Amino acid sequence: SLAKLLVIEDDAAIRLNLSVILEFVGEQCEVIESTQIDQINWSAVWGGCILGSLRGQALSEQLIQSLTKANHIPLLVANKQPYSLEEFPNYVGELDFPLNYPQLSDALRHCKEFLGRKGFQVL
Structure with a gap:
């Protein structure tokens, strides 16, 4: 992935866990809480968006939008x-x-392939 990964995760320990592991596999990421979605340029091309545990156990209408x-x-x-x-x-x-590592690599690969179909990159 060329572009950073977006991570939305309301558990601090998992924010840390995801941040450490993604960096380990050579990815950059922006890790935020679900109350920070206004801080994200959603129009830009991200490598992917990883959604984890969310306050209220559900997607807010704003995140849905x-x-x-x-x-x-x-x-x-x-x-x-x-x-x-x-x-x-x-x-x-x-x-x-x-x-x-094998399962995470596959997941990130599926993100790359998705971006490829959308016209954004070739590896």
């Missing part, structure tokens, strides 16, 4: 969540816990 408009961003879910992303056409799958 953002995820809907930003259909060019491939979406991953980190761990099993009470919410679902099936409605989103840019949803590309889930990251299994505990995280491991």
